[PDB]
Paper text:
CD4 engages gp120 by introducing its phenylalanine 43 (Phe43) in a cavity (“the Phe43 cavity”) located at the interface between the inner and outer gp120 domains. Small CD4-mimetic compounds (CD4mc) can bind within the Phe43 cavity and trigger conformational changes similar to those induced by CD4.
Unliganded structures of the LM+HS and LM+HT cores were solved at 2.2-Å and 2.5-Å resolution, respectively. Indeed, alignments showed that they have a root mean square deviation (RMSD) of 0.43 Å for their main chain atoms. Alignments to the wild-type gp12093TH057 coree, resulted in RMSD values of 0.45 Å and 0.54 Å for the LM+HS and LM+HT mutants, respectively, indicating a larger dissimilarity between the LM+HT and wild-type coree structures. Asp474 in combination with Glu102 in layer 2 formed a network of hydrogen bonds with Arg476 in both LM mutants that bridged the two layers. With respect to the issue of why T375 seems especially able to induce susceptibility to CD4mc irrespective of the LM, one clue from the structures presented here offers a possible explanation: space in the Phe43 cavity near S375 is strongly occupied by a density that may represent water or a crystallization solute, and this density is largely lacking for T375; these observations suggest higher susceptibility for T375 because it has fewer solvent molecules to eject in permitting CD4mc binding.
Author numbering: 42 to 124, 198 to 300, 325 to 355, 357 to 396, 409 to 492
Write the structure that this text describes.
């Protein structure tokens, strides 16, 4: 029966948000999202091939606008420094822990979902189903590393809009998540992250063999970022309200590609940050007393490749990205909205 035309349209959101919670993601979804589909139904689309493009699907920008909305309402800095002004207010300690959000089509439209195990984000898909809503997607803001997302079903996948353009971000979708366990124990700003060295280097070596496949068997080097602001040169993430900055030099080490134990990353909790929203500079209050612990799964990696190296034997890759959209993209690549014609 069904037939369609690809189109863009305004989505709505659904969640399990508990309405008794003071947590901020739950509050936001409690008043800006409906409940989740109590009877979710996925329909296989028989013998259809559908072209997808994760680098040009308007669901990314909608999710982005939502996360901006949530952070503007939820976070309370003591002082905001935007475009030549300075707004001051009260900065209490909030409750912070992202919850999965579902995205759903209005009537006359439907979501398509690519189920090709190794599909790279662009191109034809031969196992296409139709859903009302995406799956639940945690809105985890981070640089350098993708946290608390979804793994690739089969092999590690390299995602890029154009691998030959070195200004285009590369996303690595891992097959196997590696824990990063970060703790500020009871200088109150100093904390550390622990990663399994064995698993990390096994995964990293696999990552460069895949990168070797895509880059004509060339030698693949990892280097740290070549300067910039701390949110660029550090793996940054929010744990329990505190903004964490971690040094990833030990992770992107090439000789391990006597190193087999726990890798310990030095980190600092910052009160003064440069808002990822682009608006400007923000100041929050000193950290919570006692132990501050967050355990997360690395499930993907963000990478930028140097240019001016074509007449070399090497290709060198630094952690990076910057644009938060790619985060959302890393979970929305297998979806696209269509208009039922
Ligand atoms: C298509 O995807 C489904 C769901 O992921 C899975 O059972 C299998 O990989 C494929 N099934 C068929 C019948 O092609
Ligand atoms: C993704 O697959 C298409 C073929 O459908 C191919 O042209 C493109 O190069 C692939 N992208 C990457 C990054 O391998
Ligand atoms: C971490 O990854 C495992 C699968 O490798 C999964 O079972 C677990 O729920 C993940 N934890 C979080 C918080 O996503
Ligand atoms: C991970 O993917 C690599 C190739 O990309 C493969 O060698 C390995 O078997 C995969 N591991 C799992 C657990 O799927
Ligand atoms: C990919 O990027 C390269 C380098 O920027 C560019 O010259 C080329 O035209 C692009 N190719 C495609 C198919 O977009
Ligand atoms: C995380 O690290 C802390 C201190 O380094 C340790 O006490 C705790 O057992 C770790 N938790 C997990 C789940 O690895
Ligand atoms: C790393 O993982 C291995 C299995 O690959 C496990 O035996 C060990 O507990 C882990 N070691 C550390 C230091 O996390
Ligand atoms: C690249 O290397 C792989 C294994 O390392 C090998 O099977 C393949 O022949 C090489 N490809 C080219 C084009 O040389
Ligand atoms: C990370 O640590 C190394 C030494 O371990 C240091 O040289 C480097 O400057 C640090 N990174 C940043 C961004 O400060
Ligand atoms: C990842 O998920 C775990 C369990 O839900 C949570 O404790 C941790 O804070 C999350 N990490 C981030 C960066 O949100």
């Amino acid at each position: 029966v069904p037939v369609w035309k690809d189109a863009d349209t305004t989505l709505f959101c659904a969640s399990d948000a508990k309405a008794y919670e003071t947590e901020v993601h739950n509050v936001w979804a409690t008043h800006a999202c409906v409940p989740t589909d109590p009877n979710p139904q996925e329909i296989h689309l028989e013998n259809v091939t559908e072209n997808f493009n994760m680098w040009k699907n308007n669901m990314v920008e909608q999710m982005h606008e939502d996360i901006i909305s949530l952070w503007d309402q939820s976070l309370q800095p003591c002082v905001k420094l935007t475009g030549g002004s300075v707004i001051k207010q009260a900065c209490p300690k909030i409750s912070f822990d992202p919850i999965p959000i579902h995205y759903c089509t209005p009537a006359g439209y439907v979501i398509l979902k690519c189920n090709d195990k190794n599909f790279n984000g662009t191109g034809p898909c031969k196992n296409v189903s139709s859903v009302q809503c995406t799956h639940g997607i945690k809105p985890v803001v981070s640089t350098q590393l993708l946290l608390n997302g979804s793994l690739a079903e089969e092999e590690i996948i390299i995602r890029s809009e154009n691998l030959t353009n070195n200004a285009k971000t590369i996303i690595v979708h891992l097959n196997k998540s590696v824990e990063i366990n970060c703790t500020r124990p009871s200088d109150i700003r100093k904390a550390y992250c622990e990663i399994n060295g064995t698993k990390w280097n096994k995964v990293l070596k696999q990552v460069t063999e895949k990168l070797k496949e895509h880059f004509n068997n060339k030698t693949i080097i990892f280097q740290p970022p070549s300067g910039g602001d701390l949110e660029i040169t550090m793996h940054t993430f929010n744990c329990r309200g505190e903004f964490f900055y971690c040094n990833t030099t030990q992770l992107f080490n090439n000789t391990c590609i006597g190193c087999n134990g726990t890798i310990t990353l030095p980190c600092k909790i910052k009160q003064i940050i440069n808002m990822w929203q682009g608006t400007g500079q923000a100041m929050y209050a000193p950290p919570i007393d006692g132990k501050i612990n967050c355990v997360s799964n690395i499930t993907g990696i963000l990478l930028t490749r140097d240019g001016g190296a074509n007449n070399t034997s090497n290709e060198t890759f630094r952690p990076g990205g910057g644009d938060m959209r790619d985060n959302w993209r890393s979970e929305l690549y297998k979806y696209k909205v269509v208009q039922i014609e």
